[PDB]
Amino acid sequence: LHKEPATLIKAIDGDTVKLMYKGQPMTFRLLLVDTPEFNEKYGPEASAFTKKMVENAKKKEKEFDKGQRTDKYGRGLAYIYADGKMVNEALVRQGLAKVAYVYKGNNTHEQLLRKAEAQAKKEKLNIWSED
Numbered sequence: 708l709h710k711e712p713a714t715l716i717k718a719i720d721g722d723t724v725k726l727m728y729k730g731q732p733m734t735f736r737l738l739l740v741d742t743p744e745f746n747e748k749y750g751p752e753a754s755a756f757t758k759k760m761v762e763n764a765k766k767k768e769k770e771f772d773k774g775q776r777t778d779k780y781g782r783g784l785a786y787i788y789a790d791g792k793m794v795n796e797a798l799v800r801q802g803l804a805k806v807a808y809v810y811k812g813n814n815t816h817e818q819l820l821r822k823a824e825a826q827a828k829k830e831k832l833n834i835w836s837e838d
């Protein structure tokens with residue numbers, strides 16, 4: 708896999724972002740993760756985290772995996788990076804996303820994200836909290 712430039716149009720929520728890809732406005736869905744919807748618990752927090760992490764980065768990048776690059780809803784499927792740090796991983800590490808939607812052939816960073824999730828569980832963060 709390799710990173711390539713991502714052109715941000717706007718934040719959407721914890722696990723989707725609007726990108727300009729080859730001059731087409733597209734919703735991109737973060738691979739291997741699931742954030743709460745905005746109106747669910749930790750939804751506002753995941754939204755805010757993803758929004759700021761991407762907006763504040765001078766270098767915004769995306770990385771396709773080896774399998775499908777769009778889902779059945781026409782959303783792009785990628786890992787997103789903000790100054791070299793993977794958004795998908797950071798969400799999971801902070802307990803604002805679960806590892807989810809793991810499909811063989813688009814699962815290159817699965818182990819990386821499950822490591823992060825186990826630490827978020829150990830720390831009882833957010834999704835994994837007693838709250």
Ligand SMILES: Cc1cn([C@H]2C[C@H](OP(=O)(O)O)[C@@H](COP(=O)(O)O)O2)c(=O)[nH]c1=O
Pocket residue numbers: 736737738739740741778779784807808810
């Ligand atoms: C992350 C991801 C979601 N999806 C589909 C699975 C789910 O479809 P079903 O909708 O038919 O349940 C849906 C979840 O998206 P959201 O979590 O954005 O709602 O998107 C993929 O097909 N590929 C993926 O890599």
Ligand SMILES: [Ca+2]
Pocket residue numbers: 722741742743744
């Ligand atoms: Ca979601």
